[PDB]
Amino acid sequence: RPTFYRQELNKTIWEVPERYQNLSPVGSGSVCAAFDTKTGLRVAVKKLSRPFQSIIHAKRTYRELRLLKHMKHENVIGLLDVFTPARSLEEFNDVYLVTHLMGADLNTDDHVQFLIYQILRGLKYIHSADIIHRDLKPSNLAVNEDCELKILDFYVATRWYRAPEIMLNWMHYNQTVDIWSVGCIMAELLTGRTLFPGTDHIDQLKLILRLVGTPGAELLKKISSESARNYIQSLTQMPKMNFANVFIGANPLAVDLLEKMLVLDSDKRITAAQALAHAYFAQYHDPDDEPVADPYDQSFESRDLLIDEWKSLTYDEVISFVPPP
Ligand SMILES: CC(C)(C)c1cc(NC(=O)NCc2ccccc2Sc2ccc3nnc(-c4ccccc4SCCO)n3c2)n(-c2ccc(O)c(Cl)c2)n1
Ligand SMILES: Fc1ccc(-c2c[nH]nc2-c2ccnc(F)c2)cc1
């Protein structure tokens, strides 16, 4: 048990071990930048706000801890440490998560190549653990001075980067919803403008269909909902735009990958794994240095437990934590 020290910053109380110094707020749980005396490196510390407030909060607390303990990849946020000032389960009411400080978020062709390659390399790893990020956007991508990138999950509207099938409320979306988001981020980096700046879910889908066209016959037959089909099929039919004309001036290899990431039918979108092998990343692609994840147990997601059961499982996860070397 290390020595903790209490301190208030931005209406939030922070109780951290002595090893963490120079606590500076970055944004509000709530996050602080700090200096790790044990390693000599700058860290990011997330304090979970009211972790066991409800069954939802308690399960969410457990979910984030389980995810962060599992992620061990260069392009994904990982855990340096996890702690609590509580010395017992009974007392256990706060969770603090420690990671590498990158310094900034995401909001040259070689730059876009390097940045998107890193997203895809991190996304190949997350997707291999049967995880869907669901909220890839520039503010969920931590970037250091060296332009090295890490995928995380922390105003720039979420809806702008969301796959059209999610706007349409399809319950059976796949991992390619994340590939869509990558396509939206890549287009924005190449042009300097939000590809689809929808004001709401209806406007968002209108903007998407303007670029990718209205569904073709093969996709239309996959839509079970009568109301979704009535709405979509009542819109004026629109062809898929020529991406070479829309992204005029961009490297034609970047246009080719954009077309593969932004295909309307999710079943026809390129995967992170296939995208990493795309000609656009020839300067970076190494099939022997694009690892996959160890199996991730997400069976807990289907369970309905009491707050104290989620609290106790979280507590065991704090205790069992083993730092990286
Ligand atoms: C594995 C997956 C991607 C699916 C994922 C990740 C998360 N949760 C987090 O990423 N939580 C954030 C976090 C945890 C511990 C310590 C800090 C932070 S936030 C952070 C981390 C590193 C970093 N480096 N630089 C900055 C920074 C400094 C200033 C300005 C911007 C930035 S980066 C942009 C965000 O601040 N850093 C900030 N989850 C997950 C799962 C379940 C949940 O309920 C939640 Cl909330 C998250 N899933
Ligand atoms: F206007 C539309 C119509 C279909 C999509 C869409 C893209 N990929 N998948 C779907 C989809 C949606 C609902 N049910 C399905 F089976 C598949 C997106 C926008």
Side-chain angles (χ1 to χ4, degrees):
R1 171 54 154 69
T3 306
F4 279 71
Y5 76 100
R6 189 166 150 122
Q7 164 202 2
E8 199 237 52
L9 54 168
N10 280 221
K11 153 202 102 78
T12 315
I13 291 284
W14 286 76
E15 295 181 85
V16 305
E18 13 58 335
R19 78 173 272 189
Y20 301 109
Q21 290 297 324
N22 307 304
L23 275 281
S24 180
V26 296
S28 187
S30 311
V31 183
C32 273
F35 180 85
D36 178 4
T37 281
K38 199 187 170 192
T39 60
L41 40 90
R42 284 234 106 200
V43 295
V45 185
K46 178 188 185 188
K47 175 181 179 199
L48 296 202
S49 51
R50 327 237 187 91
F52 316 109
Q53 177 127 88
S54 64
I55 299 161
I56 287 304
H57 261 72
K59 191 172 185 178
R60 173 182 298 131
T61 298
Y62 180 71
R63 183 181 293 113
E64 183 167 27
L65 215 204
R66 284 286 313 281
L67 280 158
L68 268 15
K69 281 184 66 177
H70 193 78
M71 301 299 104
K72 293 185 186 173
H73 186 94
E74 301 186 324
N75 305 112
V76 188
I77 186 173
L79 269 189
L80 272 59
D81 190 19
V82 54
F83 59 83
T84 177
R87 42 259 300 264
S88 82
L89 216 201
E90 307 94 271
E91 206 205 336
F92 182 56
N93 222 275
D94 283 312
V95 180
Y96 295 84
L97 306 163
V98 186
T99 196
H100 285 106
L101 181 79
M102 298 282 92
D105 68 37
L106 195 73
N107 78 289
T108 301
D109 194 61
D110 186 47
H111 272 56
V112 311
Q113 275 171 238
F114 184 48
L115 262 351
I116 307 303
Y117 175 75
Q118 284 183 95
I119 296 159
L120 297 166
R121 189 175 173 248
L123 200 60
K124 171 185 178 180
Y125 176 98
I126 96 117
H127 283 179
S128 75
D130 303 297
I131 298 159
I132 302 177
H133 185 104
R134 299 171 215 91
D135 201 21
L136 282 186
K137 61 182 164 177
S139 59
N140 277 336
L141 301 169
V143 187
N144 71 14
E145 274 191 318
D146 244 25
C147 275
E148 292 165 353
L149 180 147
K150 284 181 174 271
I151 300 182
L152 50 76
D153 196 340
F154 192 61
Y155 176 80
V156 172
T158 274
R159 88 186 149 264
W160 298 345
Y161 305 92
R162 213 93 98 150
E165 60 273 29
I166 301 173
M167 230 60 61
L168 203 71
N169 204 225
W170 188 40
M171 197 185 290
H172 299 99
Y173 61 84
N174 53 238
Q175 278 174 351
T176 76
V177 301
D178 290 333
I179 290 299
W180 184 269
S181 303
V182 174
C184 291
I185 288 156
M186 168 158 78
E188 189 167 346
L189 296 190
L190 289 155
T191 75
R193 50 166 91 173
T194 307
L195 212 206
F196 310 114
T199 61
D200 58 62
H201 285 21
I202 297 167
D203 189 45
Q204 187 71 35
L205 184 66
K206 172 242 166 283
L207 299 173
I208 289 159
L209 307 177
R210 198 173 77 204
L211 184 65
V212 308
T214 39
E218 187 182 48
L219 174 59
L220 274 180
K221 85 218 285 186
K222 297 181 187 159
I223 314 170
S224 47
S225 173
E226 216 181 329
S227 60
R229 279 191 332 271
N230 281 338
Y231 174 81
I232 299 315
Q233 296 188 268
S234 294
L235 298 169
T236 309
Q237 185 239 298
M238 288 171 298
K240 178 202 151 293
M241 282 184 176
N242 184 346
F243 279 44
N245 292 336
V246 176
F247 303 98
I248 32 75
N251 173 347
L253 274 174
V255 172
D256 188 73
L257 180 63
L258 274 173
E259 300 223 62
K260 291 172 181 175
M261 295 182 161
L262 301 167
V263 45
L264 184 55
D265 192 344
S266 77
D267 287 332
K268 307 287 174 280
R269 262 118 74 170
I270 196 160
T271 68
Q274 290 164 355
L276 283 172
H278 191 279
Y280 188 54
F281 307 113
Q283 207 198 307
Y284 298 101
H285 177 61
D286 184 355
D288 306 316
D289 193 30
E290 281 162 16
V292 293
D294 287 349
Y296 176 62
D297 170 27
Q298 61 203 310
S299 66
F300 77 86
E301 290 292 9
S302 65
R303 57 197 59 107
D304 303 322
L305 315 174
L306 285 320
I307 295 170
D308 294 308
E309 293 174 312
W310 286 124
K311 173 160 142 164
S312 174
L313 290 161
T314 302
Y315 191 74
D316 305 341
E317 287 292 327
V318 172
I319 306 309
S320 67
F321 178 74
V322 166

